[PDB]
């Protein structure tokens, strides 16, 4: 993951300072594309806004960015409501978000 890259001069050349983000501590979680409450085609279903839906082997689903795990309770802000496009995961309970 690329952050910033400066360049400096050098003898007979040029040398780049590529700053990056190698990750080191993985944590294994569960990840859906999105959550449904109803089995019916045409149900109210949701997907994450600029992130991935995540559960750390936990009873309910959460929000986390695409490349790093800072889990958050999913709200209206970080959730896009769309469709039954792929097979999203039915969690068999109604929403906690207006």
Ligand X SMILES: *[C@@H]1O[C@H](CO)[C@@H](O)[C@H](O)[C@H]1NC(C)=O
Per the CB < 8 A criterion, the answer to whether 54 and 61 are in contact is yes
H or E element, residue 89: strand 89-90
The listed partner (ligand X, its own copies, none) that binds 60, CB under 5 to 8 Å by sort, is ligand X
Q: Is 75 in the site for its own copies (CB under 8 A)?
A: yes
The listed partner (ligand X, its own copies, none) that binds 75, CB under 5 to 8 Å by sort, is its own copies
The listed partner (its own copies, ligand X, none) that binds 28, CB under 5 to 8 Å by sort, is ligand X
Alpha-carbon dihedral sign for residues 9, 11, 12, 13: negative
Which stretches of the chain bind its own copies, using CB under 8 A?
41-42, 50, 75-80, 82-85, 98
């Amino acid at each position: 993951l690329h952050v910033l890259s400066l360049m400096q001069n050098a003898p007979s050349g040029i040398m780049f300072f590529h700053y990056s983000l190698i990750p080191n501590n993985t944590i294994t979680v569960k990840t859906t594309p999105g959550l449904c409450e109803s089995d019916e085609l045409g149900s109210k279903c949701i997907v994450a806004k600029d992130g991935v839906l995540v559960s750390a082997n936990l009873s309910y689903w959460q929000w986390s960015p695409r490349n790093l795990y800072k889990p958050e309770n999913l709200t209206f802000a970080n959730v896009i409501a769309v469709s039954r496009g792929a097979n999203y995961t039915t969690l068999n309970k109604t929403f906690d978000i207006p």
